Amino acid sequence: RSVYFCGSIRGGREDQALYARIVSRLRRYGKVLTEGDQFIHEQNLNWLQQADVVVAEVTQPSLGVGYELGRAVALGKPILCLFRPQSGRVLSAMIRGAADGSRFQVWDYAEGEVETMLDRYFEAYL
Amino acid sequence: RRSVYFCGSIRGGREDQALYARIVSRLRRYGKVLTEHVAEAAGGDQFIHEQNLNWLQQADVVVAEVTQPSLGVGYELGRAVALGKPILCLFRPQSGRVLSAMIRGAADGSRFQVWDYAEGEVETMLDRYFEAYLV
Ligand SMILES: O=P(O)(O)OC[C@H]1O[C@@H](n2cnc3c(NC4CCCC4)ncnc32)[C@H](O)[C@@H]1O
Ligand SMILES: O=P(O)(O)OC[C@H]1O[C@@H](n2cnc3c(NC4CCCC4)ncnc32)[C@H](O)[C@@H]1O
């Protein structure tokens, strides 16, 4: 399996710690592909096109993460978004509202059980 | 007349709210602005997504002010690219921040354009774009 991971970079780097934890756990389930700007865009689109599953941490607002998710939906890749409501933020209606059965899932989580949540997704929801 | 889809941060932050209202007002000169809302129960967000995607499908051109990072705006732009819609992104360097590489890196001739501009000059930039590519 090939996994494409999305997380804020230029939107802000604050959840770096958990992105690392998420990428580490994702390795158990497949090859994590994402572990000038035109070059970056083309590189990432190529990885997105070849991915079997897309996973995004969507707590920090980010144009690039949103864009990856939009491209991924249209490519028909199954998507898991992970959101932390304890931060006090409310998730974009365009992401929450993109939920679509097995094709697009948005899961709220508490930071301490992110690994448990990923296990559950790959075991029973994919 | 032509239809314009306008994108700008909401849950990403409303720092540029007044600017978005200026943009929507100026865009009305060139067509019907489908998304004036840019200028609730979570269980209603799928309704919003559906409504917005229907509008995005109808749109002749997609205009985004991308200075404020936003998942929704990014998603709108990704969906728009895949639908083949012409796109203008407007960004303010004086914000101090580096625009997402996925947005700047998406530039593609006249089809996807990213325009840096100075605070105060959004109306003249909109006019120049519409005059050149839509009128
Ligand atoms: O940069 P933001 O927050 O807009 O968008 C982040 C998302 O968009 C992709 N991305 C953005 N910039 C990237 C990038 N270049 C950055 C530019 C210098 C530090 C790295 N390299 C790889 N992927 C990138 C990532 O896969 C990430 O999931
Ligand atoms: O809320 P973020 O910043 O992720 O996304 C904003 C973008 O996504 C669309 N959008 C997001 N929330 C919307 C919304 N209502 C939400 C529910 C109450 C306020 C926000 N109504 C219409 N469009 C919305 C807008 O067209 C806008 O361009």
Residue numbers in the entry:
A (entry chain B): 10 to 44, 61 to 151
B (entry chain A): 9 to 47, 57 to 152
The paper states:
DNPH1 is a 2’-deoxynucleoside 5’-phosphate N-hydrolase. It hydrolyses dNMP to form a free nucleobase moiety and 2-deoxyribose 5-phosphate. DNPH1 is a potential target for anti-cancer therapies as it is involved in cellular proliferation and is up-regulated in several types of cancer. 6-substituted AMP including some cytokinin derivatives inhibit mammalian DNPH1s, specifically rat and human DNPH1s, with affinity in the micromolar range.
The X-Ray structures of three of these derivatives in complex with a recombinant variant of rat DNPH1 reveal the mechanism of the ligand recognition and suggest several routes for further optimization. High-resolution data were obtained for three complexes while the other ligands failed to provide us with decent crystals. The new structures were all obtained in the same monoclinic space group (P1211) that differs from the orthorhombic form previously described despite the similar conditions used to grow the crystals. Having one complex - rat DNPH1-7 - in common in the two available space groups, we could conclude that the absence of electron density for the long loop (residues 47-59) was due to its intrinsic flexibility rather than packing issue. This is in agreement with published NMR data. Similarly, the adenine moiety showed a conserved orientation constrained by the two sandwiching isoleucines I18 and I65 in the three complexes. Two main families of orientation are detected whatever the chemical derivatization (isopentenyl, furfuryl and cyclopentyl). 6-substitution points toward a hydrophobic subpocket formed by the side chain of isoleucine I18 and part of the side chain of arginine R19 while in other monomers, the substitution points rather outward and interacts mainly with isoleucine I65 and rather weakly with the glutamine Q68 in the case of compound 5. None of the tested substition can fit a buried sub-pocket to maximize additional interactions. This suggests that the few favorable interactions observed in one configuration or another (inward for 7 or 1 and outward for 5) are not sufficient to dramatically alter the binding affinity. Only the cyclopentyl group (compound 7) showed a favorable entropic contribution, although the ∆S term remains negative.
